[PDB]
UniProtKB/Swiss-Prot annotation, chain A:
The lineage of its organism: Eukaryota, Fungi, Dikarya, Ascomycota, Saccharomycotina. This is Large ribosomal subunit protein uL22A. PANTHER family: 60S RIBOSOMAL PROTEIN L17 (PTHR11593:SF10). Pfam families: Ribosomal_L22. There is a cross-link at K45 (Glycyl lysine isopeptide (Lys-Gly) (interchain with G-Cter in ubiquitin)). NCBIfam families: uL22_arch_euk. It comes from Saccharomyces cerevisiae (strain ATCC 204508 / S288c). One of its GO terms (cellular component) is cytosol. It is found in: Cytoplasm. Component of the large ribosomal subunit (LSU). Mature yeast ribosomes consist of a small (40S) and a large (60S) subunit. The 40S small subunit contains 1 molecule of ribosomal RNA (18S rRNA) and 33 different proteins (encoded by 57 genes). The large 60S subunit contains 3 rRNA molecules (25S, 5.8S and 5S rRNA) and 46 different proteins (encoded by 81 genes). uL22 is associated with the polypeptide exit tunnel. Keywords: Cytoplasm, Isopeptide bond, Phosphoprotein, Ribonucleoprotein, Ribosomal protein, Ubl conjugation.
Curated annotation (Swiss-Prot), chain B:
GO terms for molecular function: structural constituent of ribosome. There are 2 genes for eL31 in yeast. GO terms for biological process: cytoplasmic translation; regulation of translational fidelity. This is Large ribosomal subunit protein eL31A. It is found in: Cytoplasm. Component of the large ribosomal subunit (LSU). Mature yeast ribosomes consist of a small (40S) and a large (60S) subunit. The 40S small subunit contains 1 molecule of ribosomal RNA (18S rRNA) and 33 different proteins (encoded by 57 genes). The large 60S subunit contains 3 rRNA molecules (25S, 5.8S and 5S rRNA) and 46 different proteins (encoded by 81 genes). Belongs to the eukaryotic ribosomal protein eL31 family. It comes from Saccharomyces cerevisiae (strain ATCC 204508 / S288c). Keywords: Cytoplasm, Ribonucleoprotein, Ribosomal protein. Its main location: cytoplasm. GO terms for cellular component: cytosol; cytosolic large ribosomal subunit. InterPro entries: Ribosomal_eL31, Ribosomal_eL31_CS, Ribosomal_eL31_dom_sf.
Swiss-Prot record, chain C:
One of its GO terms (biological process) is cytoplasmic translation. Keywords: Cytoplasm, Isopeptide bond, Phosphoprotein, Ribonucleoprotein, Ribosomal protein, Ubl conjugation. Residues 58-63 have a biased composition (Basic residues). It is found in: Cytoplasm. Component of the large ribosomal subunit (LSU). Mature yeast ribosomes consist of a small (40S) and a large (60S) subunit. The 40S small subunit contains 1 molecule of ribosomal RNA (18S rRNA) and 33 different proteins (encoded by 57 genes). The large 60S subunit contains 3 rRNA molecules (25S, 5.8S and 5S rRNA) and 46 different proteins (encoded by 81 genes). eL19 lies in close proximity to the binding site for eukaryotic initiation factor eIF4G. The keyword Phosphoprotein applies. This is Large ribosomal subunit protein eL19A. It comes from the Eukaryota. There is a cross-link at K20, K52, K59 (Glycyl lysine isopeptide (Lys-Gly) (interchain with G-Cter in ubiquitin)). GO terms for cellular component: cytosol; cytosolic large ribosomal subunit. The keyword Ribonucleoprotein applies.
Curated annotation (Swiss-Prot), chain D:
This is Large ribosomal subunit protein uL3. It comes from Saccharomyces cerevisiae (strain ATCC 204508 / S288c). Component of the ribosome, a large ribonucleoprotein complex responsible for the synthesis of proteins in the cell. The small ribosomal subunit (SSU) binds messenger RNAs (mRNAs) and translates the encoded message by selecting cognate aminoacyl-transfer RNA (tRNA) molecules. The large subunit (LSU) contains the ribosomal catalytic site termed the peptidyl transferase center (PTC), which catalyzes the formation of peptide bonds, thereby polymerizing the amino acids delivered by tRNAs into a polypeptide chain. Gene3D superfamilies: 3.30.1430.10, Ribosomal protein L3, domain 3 (4.10.960.10), Translation factors (2.40.30.10). It is found in: Cytoplasm. The modification Phosphothreonine is found at T102. Belongs to the universal ribosomal protein uL3 family. One of its GO terms (biological process) is translation. Pfam families: Ribosomal_L3 (PF00297). Methylation at His-242 by HPM1 is required for proper 60S subunit assembly and promotes translational elongation fidelity. GO terms for molecular function: RNA binding; structural constituent of ribosome. There is a cross-link at K38, K135 (Glycyl lysine isopeptide (Lys-Gly) (interchain with G-Cter in ubiquitin)).
Amino acid sequence: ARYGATSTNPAKSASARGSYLRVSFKNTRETAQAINGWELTKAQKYLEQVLDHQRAIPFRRFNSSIGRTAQGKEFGVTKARWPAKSVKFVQGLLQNAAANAEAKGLDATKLYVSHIQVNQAPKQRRRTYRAHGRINKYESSPSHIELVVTEKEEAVAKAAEKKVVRLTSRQRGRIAAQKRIAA
Amino acid sequence: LKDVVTREYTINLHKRLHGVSFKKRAPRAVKEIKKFAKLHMGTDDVRLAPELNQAIWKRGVKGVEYRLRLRISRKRNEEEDAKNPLFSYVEPVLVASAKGLQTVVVEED
Amino acid sequence: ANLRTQKRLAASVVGVGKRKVWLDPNETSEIAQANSRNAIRKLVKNGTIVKKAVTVHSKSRTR
Amino acid sequence: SHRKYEAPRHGHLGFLPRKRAASIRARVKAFPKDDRSKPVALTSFLGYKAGMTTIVRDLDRPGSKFHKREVVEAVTVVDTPPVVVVGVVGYVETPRGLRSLTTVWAEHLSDEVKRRFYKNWYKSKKKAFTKYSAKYAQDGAGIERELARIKKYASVVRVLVHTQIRKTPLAQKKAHLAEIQLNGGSISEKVDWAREHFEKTVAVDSVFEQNEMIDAIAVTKGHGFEGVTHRWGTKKLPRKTHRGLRKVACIGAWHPAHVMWSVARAGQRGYHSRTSINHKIYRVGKGDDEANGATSFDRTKKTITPMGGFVHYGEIKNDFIMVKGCIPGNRKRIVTLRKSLYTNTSRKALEEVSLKWIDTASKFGKGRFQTPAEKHAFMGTLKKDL
RNA sequence: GGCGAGAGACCGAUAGCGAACAAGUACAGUGAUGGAAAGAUGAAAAGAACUUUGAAAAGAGAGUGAAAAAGUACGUGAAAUU
RNA sequence: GUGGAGGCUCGUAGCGGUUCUGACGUGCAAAUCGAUCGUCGAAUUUGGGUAUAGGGGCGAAAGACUAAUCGAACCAUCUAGU
RNA sequence: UCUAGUGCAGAUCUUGGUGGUAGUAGCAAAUAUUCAAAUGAGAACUUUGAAGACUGAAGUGGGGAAAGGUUCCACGUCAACA
RNA sequence: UACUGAUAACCGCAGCAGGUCUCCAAGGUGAACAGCCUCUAGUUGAUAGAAUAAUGUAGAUAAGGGAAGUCGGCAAAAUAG
Ligand SMILES: [Mg+2]
Ligand SMILES: [Mg+2]
Ligand SMILES: [Mg+2]
Ligand SMILES: [Mg+2]
Ligand SMILES: [Mg+2]
Ligand SMILES: [Mg+2]
Ligand SMILES: [Mg+2]
Ligand SMILES: [Mg+2]
Ligand SMILES: [Mg+2]
Ligand SMILES: [Mg+2]
Ligand SMILES: [Mg+2]
Ligand SMILES: [Mg+2]
Ligand SMILES: [Mg+2]
Ligand SMILES: [Mg+2]
Ligand SMILES: [Mg+2]
Ligand SMILES: [Mg+2]
Ligand SMILES: [Mg+2]
Ligand SMILES: [Mg+2]
Ligand SMILES: [Mg+2]
Ligand SMILES: [Mg+2]
Ligand SMILES: [Mg+2]
Ligand SMILES: [Mg+2]
Ligand SMILES: [Mg+2]
Ligand SMILES: [Mg+2]
Ligand SMILES: [Mg+2]
Ligand SMILES: [Mg+2]
Ligand SMILES: [Mg+2]
Ligand SMILES: [Mg+2]
Ligand SMILES: [Mg+2]
Ligand SMILES: [Mg+2]
Ligand SMILES: [Mg+2]
Ligand SMILES: [Mg+2]
Ligand SMILES: [Mg+2]
Ligand SMILES: [Mg+2]
Ligand SMILES: [Mg+2]
Ligand SMILES: [Mg+2]
Ligand SMILES: [Mg+2]
Ligand SMILES: [Mg+2]
Ligand SMILES: [Mg+2]
Ligand SMILES: [Mg+2]
Ligand SMILES: [Mg+2]
C-alpha cells in the first residue's frame, strides 16, 4: 500500500509489489526501466528472450566497467547484460499484476507497464575475512519492486481554457479600423 | 515440425577437440556431440545415452576417439510438453572402425 | 530420495564398504522404507542389495 | 639528467597511429603523375595474394661477384582475374581539394558487385540500380549529358572497377570495388574509353609488363593486442624484475607531467594499411595457358600452382602476377598493385629478368617433388596403383 | 553502605547510575579483569475471517479500526543517501 | 678375513629455516605457500607433570623470551596525573 | 522577571547512520569430472546407477590423547548460515 | 563411556592452504614406510560456463656463441644410481 507517484486512473489499473527481495538493486533497476512504458506481452516476451540471451537489458546508470556486446545496438548503447534473477522476480510480479487485472476485469491486451519503481531495501550483512586479521562487510543490497499496469485509452480531451484577452483602446481602434477597411 | 526420423552419422572429434585442455577433452566432446545433434536435427533438447558417455570416457579424458559413429533419433516429446516438442536421443553404434562410413537413414523396423 | 543411511547400514550388514554396496535404482521406494538393519538384511537376501564383485589385482605379470 | 648511453628511438613515428585500418582494402592515396600524351590506361590493378614461392634466375649485374651466375630468390604471387569496368566519376579541382561532381554507372551491374551494396543479400528484393538501369533505354539522355558534364569539367577522371571474385577459390562471393585513375590524355578520350569499356573486362597484361617496378598497397596481417616488446622492439627487462619484464621501465620524466605520444605503449599490432614500393614484376602469367610455371630452361608443362595447392588459398586457374620479394598482406587478402610514381633507372629496375625455374613443390611440408609424374617416377608403383 | 519514608527551578533513553528492558546481562580475555546495545501499535488485538494469482514467502482485493499516511520491520517519522 | 666404533658421513620421517632478496603482500595466513636448503642416533625431537613471576624470572647471551605485549609484561587504582 | 548542563562546520572530535569507489577488486593452491533416472515448484552441486579419476598403508583409511560438548542418530525442514 | 580428533567438530575473531601428541600399515619397481602405479577402505570436496588479447604466476624448449650479463654465475643448466 501507498505506492510511489502515479498519474493514472486506479479503476483502469492493476498493481503488484514485492518487498525485501534478495536480488540486486542495481540490476533490478535497469531491468525495470527496460520495460517501463512497454506493452505487457511485449515485455514478457522480451524478458524470456533476455533469459535465452537473444536480447539484452541495457545498463544506463549502474554500468561502470562492465562488458560490451552487440545486443546494445537495439537501445543505442554498448553496455548490456542479462540479469537472470532480476528478470525472474520482475516477470513474477508482472504475472501477479496481470492476474489482478484479470480479476478486476480489464481488457488484458491494452495493458502497458505504466509504473515500475525499484528502491533499496535494508541490507543483509555478513562478514568478510581479510588479510592481517581484519573484518569487512559483505552485504546483500535487496530490493523493493512495485509496478502498476494500466489500460491504454485513446486521445484524452480538448477545449482548453477560455483565454481571456485584455486590449487597450488603441489596439481596439486598430482592430476596428482593419475590420472597417477589410472584410 | 515433421520428420520423426532416425539416422546414423559419423562425428570427427579429432578436429573439434584440437588444441583443447586435456582435462576438458571428453567434457567438450559431450558438448560438441550435443551441438552436432542440434545442427543436424534442429533440437536443443539432446539426451545422450550413458552407453555413449562410456564410449566417450573409455580412454579417460584425453583419450577420446578421433571418430565416433552415432545413432541420432529424433523423437516426439512427452513430459508435460516443454518449449520444444522434439528431442534427439544419441546412442552409440557398435562397429569395428568408424572410418569409411557415410551418413545413412535408419528404418522404423 | 535419499539412501545414504541405507547404504551405510548395508555396508555394516554385508561386511564391506559403501564403495561395494550396490542399491538397485529401480527399487528406490522399496529401499527408502528400509529403516532397520533387519530390513536391510531382507533386501540383501532378495537381491535388492548385493555386495559387489571385488576389483581384481592380478599378480600374473609379477609371477 | 642525461641518458648515460645513446641509442635510437624504438620504432618509426611516421607510421602512427598504429591502429586498425578503416577497411580491409587499402586505398591508393596517390596515383602517378599524368602525362596527357600517352594512351589511356589504368594506373593500378586489383588482385588477391595467393602465396610465396621460390625462383631461380641468372643475375645480370656487372660489377658483382654473382654476375651471369644463378641466384635463388623469393617471389609472391597475386591472382589477378580481369577486372570489370562499371562506372566512371569525374573530379574537379577546388581550393579545398579535388571534388567529385558526378558518378556515371553502367547499365548492367553483376550480382557479385551489387552484393557490395548490401549487408544482408539473402533477404532482399535486390532492388539496386533498378531505376538507374531504366535511366537507360531512352537513348542516352540522362547518361550522355552526365558524361558531357564530366568532359566540360573534371580535370581528373577515375574509373570504377570491380573484381571477379567468383573466379577465385575464395568463398566470399562479394566483389571488391575501387576507383582507379586514368593517366592518358584528353579527358574526353578518358571518358570515351570508360564508356566503351563499360560492362567489359580489363586484363592485367594491358596494365603491367615484365621487369616493371610496382608498388603493393595492402592491409597487413593482424596480430591483435600486443605488448610493447614485439610491437616496438624494446628491450626485455632482466629476469629478476618484479611485476613483469616485458615492459618499458620509464614511460616519461616527472616533467612534462604526462605520458608523451613518443613513448612505446602496448596496443594493436597489425591490420595497418601499408604501401611497399619498388617490387619488380618477374612474370605476368595467363590463365588460358598450361605450362604457366614452365620456362625456357625447364620445359615441363606445369602450372604455377604447387602440389596440393597454395596453402589456405587454392589454385591459380586465372591470370597472375609474380612479383619479387615480400609484399604486405597475407594470403587471400585483396592487394592493390600500382605503377611507380617516379622513374627509377637505378641499374636494378632496368635489369631484364629471365627466369630459369619455378618451385612448384608443396608448401604444406618439406616437398620433395615438383610434379606428380616426378613423384611417380622416383617412388615407383604403390599399393594404391595397379 | 543496609532497611524504611518524604521531596526537587535535577536528567529525560547518545541524557540520567554501566544498567528505565530476562544488566553486572549477553559477549571478550588463561586470568586478574573488561563490559554493551536494546523503551513507545492501538482505547481495545478488534493482530486482518473469506476470494483470487502464486511452489511458497508474499501480492491484489475484502475486512477491523477514529485512523493501516497505526499491520508485531508497528507513535511522530527529519537529514545524509536512493 | 672377521667385527661393527663414531657428539663420522649420503639420505627419508622428522626438527630447523639458507637462497630465490621467488609467490603472496587490502594474503589461505597480523609471518603463510613453493622450490632450493642445514641437520637427521644425538649437546636429537617431543607429549604430559613440576619448579622459576615483573627491577623479578629465564637466557649455549640476540637485550632474546616471559600468552600477536619486553632496553622492564598484563590488570585495576592513584588519575580527569603534568 | 528569575535561572543555566543555553546556540557548532571543523577538534586524525564522540556515537550512530549513509554514500562515491562499484555490480568494481575479486570468489584461480590441493590433477577431474561426465551421462541418465528419481525426487522436487525449481537441480552444474541432493540421492541412486553407470563411467572416469585421486589419496596409495610415513593414506584423503581405521582408532585414540588433549580440546570441544551433543557436533552422534532419526524424523521434519530451508527465513537466516554454508 | 555417544561423536570429531581436523583442507568443516580443537586453537587461530571463520566451515582460515597455518598449528596441534600417538597406534595399525598390503602388492609391484627399487637399497629403501624414497619417488611412480595398483588392491582393501575412503573421497570425487574447493562457484561455474564461454573464449584463448596484452601483462603476469608456475612450468618448459631454443640455432651459433658460452658469463661478453650482473655488485656478484642471482636464477637455471650441466653432474647424478
Ligand atoms: Mg572506466
Ligand atoms: Mg576488470
Ligand atoms: Mg579473505
Ligand atoms: Mg586470523
Ligand atoms: Mg594450442
Ligand atoms: Mg648525451
Ligand atoms: Mg639519467
Ligand atoms: Mg620485425
Ligand atoms: Mg624482486
Ligand atoms: Mg609451408
Ligand atoms: Mg492518524
Ligand atoms: Mg499513526
Ligand atoms: Mg511509523
Ligand atoms: Mg532526502
Ligand atoms: Mg627432511
Ligand atoms: Mg619456507
Ligand atoms: Mg620475497
Ligand atoms: Mg598483489
Ligand atoms: Mg622429556
Ligand atoms: Mg647490542
Ligand atoms: Mg611475544
Ligand atoms: Mg583536562
Ligand atoms: Mg554545553
Ligand atoms: Mg555537526
Ligand atoms: Mg570554527
Ligand atoms: Mg571524522
Ligand atoms: Mg569481475
Ligand atoms: Mg586471487
Ligand atoms: Mg549428522
Ligand atoms: Mg562406549
Ligand atoms: Mg566409543
Ligand atoms: Mg570415535
Ligand atoms: Mg588422529
Ligand atoms: Mg583421524
Ligand atoms: Mg574453532
Ligand atoms: Mg579466543
Ligand atoms: Mg628387490
Ligand atoms: Mg610403522
Ligand atoms: Mg615404495
Ligand atoms: Mg576456493
Ligand atoms: Mg657490463
